[PDB]
Design an enzyme around this catalytic site. Structure first.
Site, PDB file in Angstrom:
ATOM      1  CB  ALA B  73     -16.180  -6.010 130.490  1.00  0.00           C
ATOM      2  CB  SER B 203     -13.340  -7.969 129.475  1.00  0.00           C
ATOM      3  OG  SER B 203     -12.551  -8.496 130.729  1.00  0.00           O
ATOM      4  CB  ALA B 204      -7.640  -7.544 128.248  1.00  0.00           C
ATOM      5  CB  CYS B 328     -37.131 -22.220 126.989  1.00  0.00           C
ATOM      6  SG  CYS B 328     -38.567 -22.237 126.517  1.00  0.00           S
TER       7      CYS B 328
END
Lengths: 385, 388
Positions: B73, B203-204, B328
């Protein structure tokens, strides 16, 4: 009938031991090497051993960088487009020198770069299928950014005089990139003796897996990243590491240098046996001098027959081979020969490319000789003369 | 005590033994180049066709659209950003890209390099619920905006972005929409047409596929200048010999991910909620982001007395793998102390512990993690001179 693979210049079989080296890093060892926990670091010694094997296999030093890419196409794109970005679009350069026989990942990239205002000279290739160092020195200007010449050609197997090109390139102070995909495992590779600044390579050429390549850089010379992001590969190429790919590529590169250092005669002798046997057929011509050719390659032109027809009659017989562009010409003795030419010429005809590997058997060669004779006779009987 | 337990699935995942089994033939048994014409090369063609079909069906893409197989990716993000810059900015009449401060480095660093080439970039901050809403993106689009790039789901908090409404706004203003969908596959329903996206990265190795293979979805085969030029692999959009094992594995993994999606919505969500409730039973702990908008497998917990890196290290000493996340301090509308998402480059950020499950997580692993988490908090608060 026997299946016989002689298209090794296109892709190679993964050595079973290389595949075994890769096996743990899919399901057993899966952590991300960029994590700090033990799952992530478990593969770190394997990655280190692999990187060391690659550095050792190509004769690189500790100062140099070896960035793991997805393929040599990535590496060529990276070096061409990054030098364009560094010294051409943001420098005072506007010229790149290359050959008309490069891989499409170099040619097509160069054409796109020319679409961006870069002047590129695709240097023609000489009788021996090679580009010599004096032509390139005559073509270097004061604006040349980079000279990109493949180490050895994938259709003819001819080896380029990359060292002499380096000497000249250093003289004129111009960067030198070589597409060395066909060199690893077939010829000695010492990237400091070659003097190259950049070198591309691909694991699936020397029996590694598909999906992993590399780009070598001398002395960590600056090169703008093609893939930006995280600090993988020293901040030079982002994206999660292909851990199995790296492990396998390292093992394959070590094996390639071992089999070149000892199993060098087996592949060369079988190539020469096959080539002699084929050349005993009337009106056959092998492209390129054997004494400057990789040990595994033959590119043969059969007269009367067409290369694609010869390819498919071989495929019907279970033999995988490929095509190669050639041009009709003569030598200095005025003897008709077949020589290398860019594919985009009109004077090209298709010759048959046969490429062996360390897994080729002599039986495969006897079968290939017999079937080659058979196919030649059957097809010359059906066409032209 | 010590038991190895993997709760860092948002970083990478284990390869399903079935995905590895699907891949195995395509190293040594079936090795021909798919671009060759002989039988050795074409033998793998049906597996590539089946894998490509698996991907299209998994993300709800249509036949007109394109799915180009990348190396990761990161490649897809670099490609979409630099290609739109080339098409609509350097050779067009645009100069603006809108994104978030919580994108993956693949997109942030690329955007900064694009700023280094004269591109105006707005890194939109993320709200309390950890998301960018569609009306703010609309307020920031002009007639120079070339692309809006907003991740589908956050990798640190698991918060899901309202990609459908953002797409509606983008289509009203006629501006291209890309999403980083790496965190979406296997955790939420993914229909790239209902999301209205023009580009999607995935993305695999996030959905139990192998490392080294990713994808970029493109709507309607929209023109996008190649990042990798050369031969005509992948329709001439991404050159280089096909990663045949990666493609087959990615197809199988994506099919498995959509099959297991309801296992992940039910069982994995149940284990996530057990772990998160148990951890929140500790005083002065805060889960980042609302759960009702979060992927089923993710927790980002901020502990007040303890430091995140220390908590990661001794959790790892107990065999537990987790990660970090930026947070935060803030309040709600009732003025109650909460921890909220923030960009990593903020100076108001501190490190929270990220725990991400998968379909392979066991209730024993969750129980052990609860006990070890409690131990570590107590241990590190017991050494503080400040905490009260």
């Amino acid at each position: 009938h026997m299946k016989v693979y002689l298209d090794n210049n296109a892709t190679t079989i993964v050595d079973p031991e290389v595949k075994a080296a890769m096996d743990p890093y899919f399901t057993q060892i899966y952590g991300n090497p960029n994590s700090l926990h033990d799952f992530g670091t478990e593969c770190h010694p394997a990655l280190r051993k692999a990187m060391d094997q690659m550095y050792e296999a190509i004769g690189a030093r500790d100062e140099d960088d070896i960035v793991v890419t997805s393929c040599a196409t990535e590496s060529n794109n990276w070096v061409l487009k990054g030098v364009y970005f560094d010294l051409i679009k943001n420098g005072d350069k506007d010229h790149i020198i290359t050959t008309e026989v490069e891989h499409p990942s170099v040619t097509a990239t160069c054409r796109w770069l020319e679409e961006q205002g870069v002047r590129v000279t695709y240097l023609p290739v000489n009788q021996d299928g090679v580009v010599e160092a004096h032509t390139v020195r005559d073509f270097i200007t004061d604006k040349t950014a980079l000279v990109s010449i493949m180490w050895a050609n994938n259709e003819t197997g001819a080896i380029f005089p990359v060292e002499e090109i380096s000497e000249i390139c250093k003289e004129k102070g111009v960067l030198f990139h070589t597409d060395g995909v066909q060199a690893i495992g077939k010829i000695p590779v010492d990237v400091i003796r070659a003097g190259v600044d950049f070198m591309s390579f691909s694991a699936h050429k020397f029996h590694g897996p598909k999906g992993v390549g590399g780009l070598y850089i001398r002395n960590g010379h600056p090169l703008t990243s093609l893939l930006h992001g995280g600090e993988h590969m020293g901040g030079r190429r982002s994206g999660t590491l292909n851990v199995p790919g790296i492990v396998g590529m390292g093992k394959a590169m070590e094996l390639a240098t071992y089999y070149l250092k000892f199993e060098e005669e087996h592949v060369r002798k079988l190539r020469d046996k096959l080539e002699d046997a084929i050349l005993e057929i009337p009106d056959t011509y092998s492209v390129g001098p054997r004494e400057n050719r990789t040990p595994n390659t033959i590119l043969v032109s059969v007269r009367g027959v067409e290369g694609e027809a010869m390819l498919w009659d071989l495929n019907r017989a279970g033999i995988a081979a490929s095509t190669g562009s050639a041009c009709a010409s003569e030598d200095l003795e005025a003897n008709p020969i077949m020589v290398a030419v860019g594919a985009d010429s009109e004077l090209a005809h298709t010759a048959v490319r046969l490429s062996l590997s360390r897994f080729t058997t002599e039986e495969e060669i006897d079968y290939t000789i017999e079937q080659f004779k058979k196919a030649v006779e059957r097809l010359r009987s059906i066409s032209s003369s």
